[PDB]
A paper describes a structure:
Proteins of the RRNPPA family are the most frequent pheromone receptors in Bacillota and use small secreted oligopeptides as pheromones. While most members of the RRNPPA family act as transcriptional factors through DNA binding, Rap receptors are specialized members that exhibit the capability to develop their function by interaction with specific protein targets. Binding of the pheromone produced from the propeptide, which is named Phr in this RRNPPA subfamily, induces Rap receptor inhibition. Our results reveal that distinct maturation processes generate multiple mature pheromones, which bind to receptors with varying affinities but produce identical structural and biological responses.
In addition to the 2 putative pheromones RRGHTA and SRGHTS, we included in the analysis an extended (RRGHTAS) and a shorter (RGHTS) version of the internal and C-terminal putative pheromones, respectively, that could represent alternative forms of their maturation. Only a 20% reduction in the affinity (EC50 = 6,70 nM) was observed for the possible maturation variant of the internal Phr3T pheromone (RRGHTAS) with an extra amino acid. To molecularly assess the differences in affinity and stabilization for the alternative peptides analyzed we solved the structures for Rap3T in complex with RRGHTAS, SRGHTS, and RGHTS. Meanwhile complexes with RRGHTAS and RGHTS peptides exhibited P21 space group and a Rap dimer in the asymmetric unit. Remarkably, these structures exhibited nearly identical conformations as confirmed by the low differences in the superimposition of their Cα atoms for either individual monomers or the complete dimers (RMSD 0.36–0.50), dispelling the notion of peptides eliciting divergent conformational shifts. Notice that the molecular conformational are due to peptide binding and not induced by the crystallization conditions since crystals were obtained in 2 different space groups and cell dimensions. Interestingly, the structure of the complex with RRGHTAS peptide showed that the additional Ser residue lacks electron density that prevented its building, supporting the idea that this residue does not participate in the binding and that RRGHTA is the genuine mature peptide version.
Author numbering:
A (entry chain A): 8 to 72, 75 to 373
B (entry chain C): 2 to 7
The structure:
């Protein structure tokens, strides 16, 4: 078993390097070795965990569109061997499960898993593997708008990654997290260099997904600066990048469509805003993303028919999904809309919701 | 909306 265990370690190394050809080679090698040794319950779980992690990489690089996804059968195979776990295998189990939960918008489960992984971090001698942990922990803290916690882990990650060679993908992703934390501190001019750096690296390694994401993150800065026409240009080109290189069905394209929709209404192009909102809504429904659909439903209910009962119900829903930053962003949109319309009694209510969300966020 | 963290 040490021989097969080394191979699975090698496999994981290539996954972290985003070298799909090597990962597939190692995957096929491991499966050949398994078919002969075939006598080790832990080695098999490590195998199923790496299968899991490998698919996570593939789903990020090529999103697959009726059939039970490969990720679900692997997750089932992995959740049957939870008793008597120990050592680094236990760290992997909780870390990989945390990653999966994060991809399903199961934020509380994800922190729960990550925190269990954190306890065994002194078991992880590999500095690059610890960087993976810190990067992924920083990411979820950013999505929870735990800015200081997020920066605390992200700096640890990027130093490790920047100390090695060929972790370019993760270095871009760390630049995303750093920049986005500055944006959450109201420093869009501090965020832009990080995203411009990422965009340049994303173009050098010709990774369309990261190119489209850099343009989106830049569009978010212009939006914050109220440079709405420039934000709109960034959002459109990012959408085009995604749509032209096989990511037209990536759930994360919905973020760019959402912000373009908001942007179009901010420029008072009412009809175009509805058009974008409806396209984003339809795609959300076709990608079976309930959470994204709700956000498109909110913007439409805000700018089109002023359905405040529906706005309130959506804000409550996102809070139950532990997505307080979106509660804050969406309540802020409604507050500012009703303020401009001089419906100040309604604007007050949404400002109170913005204040409530910020307090929930600060409560940690 | 949250930025892209990939």
């Amino acid at each position: 078993s040490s021989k097969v265990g080394v191979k699975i370690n090698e496999w994981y190394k290539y996954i972290r390097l985003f070298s799909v050809p090597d990962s597939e080679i190692l995957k096929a090698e491991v499966e050949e070795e398994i078919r002969h040794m075939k006598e080790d319950h832990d080695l098999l779980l490590y195998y199923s965990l790496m299968c899991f992690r490998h698919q996570l990489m593939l789903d990020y690089l090529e999103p697959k569109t009726e059939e039970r996804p490969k990720i679900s059968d692997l997750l089932e195979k992995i959740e049957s061997s939870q008793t008597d776990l120990k050592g680094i295998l236990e760290y992997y189990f909780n870390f990989f499960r945390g990653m999966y939960e994060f991809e399903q918008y199961e934020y509380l489960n994800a922190i729960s898993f990550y925190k269990q992984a954190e306890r065994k971090l002194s078991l992880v001698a590999d500095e690059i593997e610890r960087a993976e942990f810190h990067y992924k922990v920083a990411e979820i803290y950013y999505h929870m708008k735990q800015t200081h916690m997020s920066m605390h882990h992200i700096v640890q990650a990027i130093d490790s990654y920047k100390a090695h060679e060929n972790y370019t993908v993760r270095v871009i992703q760390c630049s995303f997290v750093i920049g986005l934390n500055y944006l959450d501190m109201d420093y869009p001019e501090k965020a832009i260099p990080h995203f411009k750096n990422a965009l340049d690296k994303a173009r050098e390694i010709d990774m369309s997904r990261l190119i489209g994401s850099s343009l989106y993150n830049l569009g978010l800065c212009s939006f914050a600066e109220e440079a709405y026409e420039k934000a709109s240009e960034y959002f459109k080109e990012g959408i085009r990048v995604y749509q032209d290189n096989g990511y037209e069905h990536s759930n994360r394209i919905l973020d760019i469509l959402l912000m373009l929709t908001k942007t179009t209404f901010k420029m008072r192009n009412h009809s175009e805003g509805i058009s974008w909102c409806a396209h984003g809504l339809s795609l959300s429904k076709n990608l079976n993303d309930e959470i994204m659909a709700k956000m498109f439903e909110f913007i439409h209910a805000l700018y089109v028919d002023n359905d405040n009962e529906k706005l309130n119900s959506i804000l409550n829903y996102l809070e139950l999904k532990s997505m307080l930053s979106d509660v804050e962003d969406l309540a802020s949109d409604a507050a500012k809309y009703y303020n401009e319309k001089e419906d100040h009694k309604v604007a007050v209510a949404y400002y109170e919701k913005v204040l409530y969300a910020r307090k929930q966020i600060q409560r940690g | 909306r949250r930025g892209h963290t990939a």
